[PDB]
Amino acid sequence: DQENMLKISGYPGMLNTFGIAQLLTPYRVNGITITGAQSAVVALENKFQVYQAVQDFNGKKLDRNHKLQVSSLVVSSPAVPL
Amino acid sequence: QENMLKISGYPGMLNTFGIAQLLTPYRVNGITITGAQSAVVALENKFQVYQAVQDFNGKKLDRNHKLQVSSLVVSSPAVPL
Amino acid sequence: TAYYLKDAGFHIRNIPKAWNDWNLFHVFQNFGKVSYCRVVGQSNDGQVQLGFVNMMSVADADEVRKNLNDGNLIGENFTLKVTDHKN
Amino acid sequence: STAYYLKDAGFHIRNIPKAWNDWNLFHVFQNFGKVSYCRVVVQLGFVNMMSVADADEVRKNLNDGNLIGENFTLKVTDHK
């Protein structure tokens, strides 16, 4: 299910899956997939939490050495203009 | 044993990721759920446990939830402060 | 019908017929973070829709309530009937 | 998951009074922020703060790298 997913990277490399979940507070995390990478693919509750997480966290400076990168296939798609 | 803390009082909906989110920024290594609103949590070491109990015991999350956070850990300096 | 954070959700009635869930969402996002946002049915010949919106926290829900006028959310060009979800 | 703790957040401590244990060292540093790790080996020690922000505050309270209390002077250096 495509629109529950975001990619996050640029977080400190020592984080475990709980620590990646802490990054995303307060959004509901249902799954984290860790690979050989220093990125992770995270499943959130739904497209609205994904949309808000990308907003909140993409580009966020954690400190002088870590600027998060967060991205997803989710585009805000109102039926009528706002 | 000194890595453990007991946490309870959070919303009953939280999965274990949500319980770990409560303890930001302390490092969580394992969570064992012991009720609808209670869990045993393994943190990184005793100083994070001690600090977590300080920051979060009695913390009011909202008007319907108050955390009770406890541990076996006590501050035991060899020389007084 | 599902597990929700006490005092954080709202039932919406009288939603304009052309909105989808993104419209509904963007309305409540102006007051705080949103957990669940859903169009749950139609009503009055199909002319208005019913909705449900759960906020990320009670604080966020109370931020919605503070902008409420006798149970109604007045915006530019719409009025929704917002009602506290009780468990 | 990497092998190394967070960057710019650790310190090496020399000049620790010999009677101190980890709890004594811990409490000195807790005054500047949350502490992630704390060990003693006069004696040497290591303290990692929870974040760079905490550890920078530690750095904001130094004199040519020294932490001065009433009965002690710890020599403190960045773990890089």
Residue numbers in the entry:
A (entry chain C): 200 to 281
B (entry chain D): 201 to 281
C (entry chain A): 6 to 92
D (entry chain B): 5 to 45, 53 to 91
Manuscript text:
By using functional proteomics, we and another group independently identified a piRNA biogenesis and chromosome segregation (PICS) complex (also named as PETISCO) that plays important roles in 21U-RNA biogenesis, chromosome segregation and cell division. The PICS complex is composed of TOFU-6, PICS-1 (also names as PID-3), ERH-2 and two mutually exclusive factors, PID-1 and TOST-1. The PID-1 containing complex is functional in piRNA maturation and processes piRNA precursors at 5′ termini via its association with IFE-3, while the TOST-1 containing form is essential for chromosome segregation and cell division in embryos. Complemented by biochemical and mutagenesis experiments, our structural biology data support that PICS is an octamer composed of two copies of each subunit, and unveil the assembly interface within PICS complex.
Consistent with previous work, PICS-1(PID-3) and TOFU-6 interact with each other via RRM domains, which were previously identified as the RNA binding modules. Given that the two structures are almost identical, the native one was used for structural analysis. TOFU-6C primarily interacts with PICS-1A through α1-β2 of TOFU-6C, and α2 and a C-terminal fragment of PICS-1A. α1 of TOFU-6C interacts with α2 of PICS-1A via both hydrophobic and electrostatic interactions. Specifically, Trp27, Phe30, His31, and Cys42 of TOFU-6C, make hydrophobic interactions with Lys246, Phe247, and Tyr250 of PICS-1A. Asp26 and Gln34 of TOFU-6C form salt bridges with Lys246 and Gln254 of PICS-1A, respectively. TOFU-6C also contacts with the other protomer of PICS-1(PID-3) (PICS-1B). The N-terminus and α2 of TOFU-6C interact with two loops of PICS-1B, one between β1 and α1 and the other between α2 and β4. Tyr8 and Leu10 of TOFU-6C make hydrophobic contacts with Pro211, Met213, and His265 of PICS-1B. Asp12 and Asp67 of TOFU-6C form salt bridges with Arg263 of PICS-1B. The PICS-1(PID-3) F217E mutant, which disrupts the homodimerization, failed to associate with perinuclear granules.
